[PDB]
Amino acid sequence: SGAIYVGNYRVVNRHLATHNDWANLVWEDSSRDLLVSSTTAQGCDTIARCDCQTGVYYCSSRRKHYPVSFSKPSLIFVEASEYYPARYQSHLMLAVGHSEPGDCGGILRCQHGVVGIVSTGGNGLVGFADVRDLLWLDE
Ligand SMILES: CSc1cccc(Br)c1CC(=O)N1CCC[C@H](C(N)=O)C1
Ligand SMILES: [Zn+2]
């Protein structure tokens, strides 16, 4: 679990979104596993606007932060789950690192701010759902 709080916005994994998230829905995309919802209290997170391919992410299953090299946002095939049928998820960045089901929501940061959140994983890999293209979070 985890979320990005930037201004009057909350960015969460679409599969982990609450009833309140849907009641104050701003934007959602199944293919990216993202859901943004309006909050009534001011956020704080700086959103990175960059092309960094290295960073640090919080691993909930180890209570530790890990430095990683990650790929550029792309369409990577993600297998069937209780939340989605087998499909291509876009804006995904894979990395070599530890990941497990309860890790979705962990923030990936670089020297410029928040890059994205943990979305996929498995097999000694971790997948991040990029948010750097969503310029309207800061405006
Ligand atoms: C039990 S499979 C597994 C294994 C290691 C790490 C992780 Br995180 C998972 C779970 C996983 O990748 N997903 C399930 C939830 C929705 C995700 C999506 N964005 O489509 C995909
Ligand atoms: Zn950066």
Curated annotation (Swiss-Prot):
Subunit structure, as described in the record: Homodimer.
Function (record text): Cysteine protease that cleaves viral polyprotein and specific host proteins. It is responsible for the autocatalytic cleavage between the P1 and P2 regions, which is the first cleavage occurring in the polyprotein. Also cleaves the host translation initiation factor EIF4G1, in order to shut down the capped cellular mRNA translation. Inhibits the host nucleus-cytoplasm protein and RNA trafficking by cleaving host members of the nuclear pores. Counteracts stress granule formation probably by antagonizing its assembly or promoting its dissassembly.
Chemical reaction(s) catalysed: Selective cleavage of Tyr-|-Gly bond in the picornavirus polyprotein
Organism phylogeny: Viruses, Riboviria, Orthornavirae, Pisuviricota, Pisoniviricetes
Active site: 15, 33, 104
UniProt source species: Coxsackievirus A16 (strain G-10)
Protein name, per record: Protease 2A
Record: residues binding Zn(2+) 1: 50, 52, 110, 112
